Amino acid sequence: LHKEPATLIKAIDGDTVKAMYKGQPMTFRLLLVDTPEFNEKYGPEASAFTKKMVENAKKIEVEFDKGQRTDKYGRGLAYKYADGKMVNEALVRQGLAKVAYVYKGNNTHEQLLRKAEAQAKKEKLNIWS
Ligand SMILES: Cc1cn([C@H]2C[C@H](OP(=O)(O)O)[C@@H](COP(=O)(O)O)O2)c(=O)[nH]c1=O
Ligand SMILES: [Ca+2]
């Protein structure tokens, strides 16, 4: 996979971030994760975690997988990186997202994220507490 440039527009919630990509605004939905909705337990905590990560970064990048790049809502499906650190993985490692929506052909980083989830679960963090 390849990292491409994006510029933060707005963090939306734990797993969606609006960013300028090839000069157009796109809402990105993070691949292979599911954060709680803001109205749900750990929802505000996930939202804040992603918000801090992307806002504090000198740069953000998006990395598409091999399969679908857009979902049925027109959201970009990507791995998002904040100064080279993957947001998707960080959320899972902190127990603020479950590995989820793992579709064949768009699951390059599944094992990375499963390993993170196992570690979060062992530490009883957040959703696993
Ligand atoms: C992460 C992801 C979500 N989606 C779709 C499936 C779900 O459809 P449904 O809306 O019908 O439940 C929805 C979940 O996104 P959210 O967790 O943001 O609600 O987004 C994909 O199609 N591909 C993806 O890779
Ligand atoms: Ca969600």
Coordinates of C-alpha atoms and ligand atoms in Angstrom, one line a residue:
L1 CA 0.0 0.0 0.0
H2 CA 0.9 3.7 -0.5
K3 CA 0.5 6.7 1.8
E4 CA -1.0 9.8 0.1
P5 CA -1.3 13.4 1.4
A6 CA -4.4 14.7 3.0
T7 CA -5.1 17.9 5.0
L8 CA -7.3 17.8 8.1
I9 CA -10.7 19.6 7.7
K10 CA -12.5 18.3 10.9
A11 CA -12.4 15.3 13.2
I12 CA -16.0 14.0 13.3
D13 CA -16.0 11.0 15.7
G14 CA -13.9 8.1 16.7
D15 CA -13.7 6.6 13.3
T16 CA -14.6 9.3 10.8
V17 CA -12.5 12.3 9.9
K18 CA -13.1 14.9 7.2
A19 CA -10.0 15.8 5.2
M20 CA -8.9 17.4 2.0
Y21 CA -7.8 14.7 -0.5
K22 CA -6.5 15.5 -4.0
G23 CA -7.9 19.0 -3.2
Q24 CA -11.5 17.9 -2.5
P25 CA -13.2 17.4 0.8
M26 CA -13.8 13.7 1.6
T27 CA -15.2 12.1 4.8
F28 CA -12.9 9.2 5.6
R29 CA -14.2 6.2 7.5
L30 CA -11.4 4.3 9.1
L31 CA -10.8 0.8 7.7
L32 CA -11.2 -2.3 9.9
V33 CA -12.4 -0.6 13.1
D34 CA -15.6 0.3 14.8
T35 CA -15.7 3.0 17.5
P36 CA -18.8 3.4 19.7
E37 CA -21.1 6.2 18.5
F38 CA -20.8 9.4 20.5
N39 CA -24.1 8.6 22.2
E40 CA -22.6 5.2 23.5
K41 CA -20.2 4.3 26.2
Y42 CA -16.6 5.2 25.2
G43 CA -18.0 7.1 22.3
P44 CA -16.9 10.5 23.6
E45 CA -13.6 9.0 24.6
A46 CA -13.0 7.6 21.1
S47 CA -14.0 10.8 19.4
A48 CA -11.6 12.8 21.6
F49 CA -8.8 10.3 21.0
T50 CA -9.0 10.5 17.2
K51 CA -9.6 14.3 17.4
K52 CA -6.4 14.9 19.4
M53 CA -4.4 12.5 17.2
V54 CA -5.2 14.2 13.9
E55 CA -5.3 17.8 15.2
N56 CA -1.9 17.5 16.9
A57 CA -0.2 16.0 13.8
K58 CA 2.1 18.0 11.6
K59 CA 0.7 15.9 8.8
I60 CA -1.9 13.4 8.1
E61 CA -1.9 10.8 5.3
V62 CA -4.4 8.3 4.0
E63 CA -3.6 4.9 2.7
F64 CA -6.2 3.0 0.6
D65 CA -6.3 -0.7 0.5
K66 CA -6.6 -2.9 -2.6
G67 CA -10.4 -3.2 -2.7
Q68 CA -13.2 -0.7 -2.3
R69 CA -12.0 2.9 -1.8
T70 CA -15.5 4.4 -1.2
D71 CA -18.4 3.0 0.8
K72 CA -22.1 3.1 -0.2
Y73 CA -22.4 6.5 1.6
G74 CA -19.5 8.0 -0.4
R75 CA -17.1 7.9 2.5
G76 CA -13.4 7.2 1.7
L77 CA -12.2 3.9 3.2
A78 CA -8.7 4.2 4.4
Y79 CA -6.0 3.8 6.9
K80 CA -5.2 7.2 8.4
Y81 CA -1.7 8.2 9.6
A82 CA -0.9 11.0 12.0
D83 CA 2.8 11.8 11.7
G84 CA 3.4 8.3 10.5
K85 CA 1.3 6.6 13.3
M86 CA -1.8 4.7 12.2
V87 CA -4.9 6.0 13.9
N88 CA -6.8 2.8 13.2
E89 CA -4.3 0.7 15.0
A90 CA -3.9 3.3 17.9
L91 CA -7.7 3.3 18.6
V92 CA -7.7 -0.5 18.8
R93 CA -4.6 -0.7 20.9
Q94 CA -6.3 1.6 23.4
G95 CA -9.5 -0.4 23.6
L96 CA -11.5 2.5 22.0
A97 CA -12.4 0.5 18.9
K98 CA -13.1 -3.1 18.0
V99 CA -11.6 -4.7 14.9
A100 CA -14.7 -4.8 12.6
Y101 CA -15.9 -4.6 9.0
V102 CA -13.2 -6.9 7.8
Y103 CA -14.0 -7.6 4.2
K104 CA -11.8 -9.8 1.9
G105 CA -9.8 -7.7 -0.5
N106 CA -9.7 -4.7 1.9
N107 CA -7.9 -6.2 4.9
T108 CA -4.2 -5.7 4.5
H109 CA -3.7 -4.6 8.1
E110 CA -6.1 -7.0 9.8
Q111 CA -3.5 -9.0 11.6
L112 CA -1.7 -5.9 12.8
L113 CA -5.0 -4.6 14.3
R114 CA -6.0 -8.0 15.7
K115 CA -2.7 -8.1 17.5
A116 CA -3.4 -4.7 18.9
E117 CA -6.9 -5.8 20.0
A118 CA -5.6 -8.8 21.8
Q119 CA -3.2 -6.5 23.7
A120 CA -6.0 -4.1 24.7
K121 CA -8.1 -7.0 25.8
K122 CA -5.3 -8.4 28.0
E123 CA -4.9 -5.0 29.6
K124 CA -8.6 -4.7 30.1
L125 CA -8.6 -1.2 28.5
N126 CA -11.7 0.9 28.0
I127 CA -14.3 -1.2 26.0
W128 CA -12.6 -4.4 27.4
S129 CA -12.9 -3.2 31.0
Ligands
LIG1 C1 -15.7 0.4 7.7 C2 -16.7 0.1 6.6 C3 -18.0 0.4 6.8 N1 -18.9 0.2 5.7 C4 -20.3 0.4 5.9 C5 -21.0 -0.9 6.5 C6 -22.1 -0.3 7.4 O1 -23.3 -0.2 6.6 P1 -24.6 0.1 7.5 O2 -24.7 1.6 7.7 O3 -25.9 -0.3 6.6 O4 -24.7 -0.5 8.9 C7 -21.6 1.1 7.8 C8 -21.0 1.2 9.2 O5 -20.3 2.5 9.3 P2 -20.4 3.2 10.7 O6 -19.8 2.2 11.8 O7 -19.7 4.5 10.5 O8 -22.0 3.4 11.1 O9 -20.5 1.4 6.9 C9 -18.4 -0.4 4.6 O10 -19.2 -0.6 3.7 N2 -17.2 -0.7 4.4 C10 -16.3 -0.5 5.4 O11 -15.1 -0.9 5.2
CA2 CA -18.9 3.6 14.4

